[PDB]
Design a protein around this ligand. Sequence first.
Ligand SMILES: Nc1ncnc2c1ncn2[C@@H]1O[C@H](COP(=O)(O)OP(=O)(O)NP(=O)(O)O)[C@@H](O)[C@H]1O
Ligand SMILES: [Mg+2]
Ligand SMILES: [Zn+2]
Length: 390
Amino acid sequence: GIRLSTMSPRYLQSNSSSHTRPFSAIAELLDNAVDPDVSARTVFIDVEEVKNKSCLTFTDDGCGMTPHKLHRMLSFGFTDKCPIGVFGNGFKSGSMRLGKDALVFTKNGGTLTVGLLSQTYLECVQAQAVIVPIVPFNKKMIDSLPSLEAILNYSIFNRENDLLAQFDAIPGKKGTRVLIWNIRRNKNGKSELDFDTDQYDILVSDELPETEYSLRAFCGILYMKPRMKIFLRQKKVTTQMIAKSLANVEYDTYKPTFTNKQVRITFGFSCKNQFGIMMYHNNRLIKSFEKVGCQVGVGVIGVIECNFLKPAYNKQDFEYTKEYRLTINALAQKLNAYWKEKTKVPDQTWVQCDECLKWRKLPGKIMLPARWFCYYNSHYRRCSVPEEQE
Ligand SMILES: Nc1ncnc2c1ncn2[C@@H]1O[C@H](COP(=O)(O)OP(=O)(O)NP(=O)(O)O)[C@@H](O)[C@H]1O
Ligand SMILES: [Mg+2]
Ligand SMILES: [Zn+2]
């Protein structure tokens, strides 16, 4: 009837500017593997060399997607959503922020579907609109025929057997695998992300917290209570409950002016030197190590989850409202009170079971073990007992 609002392929480049830091795009991808619909048990971040080209790999063993839902994924604004995703843009901004081209393999226990979000493909054919090739799969193919030809002719996978074997890189029968190539290179010529300095870490070519340049430490605190396992370059990331790993822990509260829900704030001391305020939102870290009050008070960390706020388009900050300024003022005042109240090893030690993903409180020390199971506890010794009261 009426002509639709088209979208230029340049928009894929434009949208990539949503994230000012690449760890935020990577966080977008991890947030998509952890949301309750998918609820992946494990995600794998790695760098793989394909066709003499560096590729970022994000492989989760989650629910998987249908060919229809994969198109919805590669489309804008489509989301069936305390999940983290709200916009229906996270992947389209994050993957493009990481590289020019992205492939998404997904299997949901019966269908093998491939999707391509590549600006290189769109610029080679000089398309005027955004074209997204998608192919579903016995492994017999199922509309998808020109998509498969475009993928074989313009992506990094030229042979059909290699394209299908990429599904075997999912550690289960259901899961998703994102593969981003043509990564962002900064002005000095090198790649923005560092793969060679630390074989078990992805760094940034940079006082400044180690979370700002170390992807391992960033993933360690990306979530307020981790439930999903993260493997950075085949090595498990020892995540932590940033609130429970503090010493001399005291508590405070904050009431938003537009509701009657008390929000708990946890104040403590860091055990390894760096510090500030951890502002979360639906378990996701939005603002990290924000100095408030007498910190501009060394070593004190305050944890707060602000579900009464709403993050920005990139989930790196919040909307600048009266509630936000009031929350920061309150945090500064209460942190000053906490530090005034005081004039090592954490008060509690918590470990996540490797097979079980629950957090158990141990009477021990804190770094933390790589693999640990409920069966190894000192009494809660079985993986069938739920978490503690917390
Ligand atoms: N790794 C994944 N595994 C399974 N399903 C996924 C995955 N990534 C995306 N999806 C699905 O595809 C949709 C695309 O989401 P996306 O465009 O990234 O934004 P969103 O997750 O909907 N919310 P937002 O991140 O704020 O934009 C998701 O809502 C899921 O339904
Ligand atoms: Mg998303
Ligand atoms: Zn367990």
